[PDB]
Amino acid sequence: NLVTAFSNMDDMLQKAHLVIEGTFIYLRDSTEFFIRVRDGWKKLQLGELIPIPA
Amino acid sequence: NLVTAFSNMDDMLQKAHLVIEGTFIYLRDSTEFFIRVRDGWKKLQLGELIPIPA
Amino acid sequence: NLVTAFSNMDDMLQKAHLVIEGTFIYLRDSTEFFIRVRDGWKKLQLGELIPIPA
């Protein structure tokens, strides 16, 4: 539907049925993103962390 | 606005006016993602399929 | 929450507190995408512009 999150990848992996296909998944611990697709997930390619200006 | 989908890329290509710029596009057949932008689309870089745990 | 936008990267960089972590950020001028994460942003890897069919 939109975007949800999990503490980490393993939490995401065990809750495949709680996420509808085509939804974005944020991993709080690693600040990474995955997408729930048919029969699994796919990792979104993200760049290096851009620190917030002072 | 958010996220929509098409069966495949060609269906997406012929419906450019049905998707507002800045929207995410899921291709059901290839489980790929595109983003509708100014004057076209851009393919989102996704990783290999991560199979669901047994 | 979902998706928002800025004219360009610099406008985005000065408004870090206007975007909640886990939100997608579209840059109108460069038609690029970033994601607001913990302590900053991360650039989404996008492909070359796919022109709209005539």
Curated annotation (Swiss-Prot), chains A, B, C:
Tissue specificity annotation: Detected in fibroblasts and urine (at protein level). Detected in placenta (at protein level). Expressed predominantly in internal organs such as adrenal gland, pancreas and kidney.
Modification after translation, per record: Prolines at the third position of the tripeptide repeating unit (G-X-Y) are hydroxylated in some or all of the chains. O-glycosylated; with core 1 or possibly core 8 glycans. Contains chondroitin sulfate.
Subcellular location(s) of the protein: Secreted, Extracellular space, Extracellular matrix; Secreted
Assembly behavior = Trimer; disulfide-linked.
Describe the function of this protein: Structural protein that stabilizes microvessels and muscle cells, both in heart and in skeletal muscle.
The record's family statement is: Belongs to the multiplexin collagen family.
Q: What is this protein called?
A: Collagen alpha-1(XV) chain
Please give the first and last residues shown and the length of the full protein.
1133 to 1186 of 1388
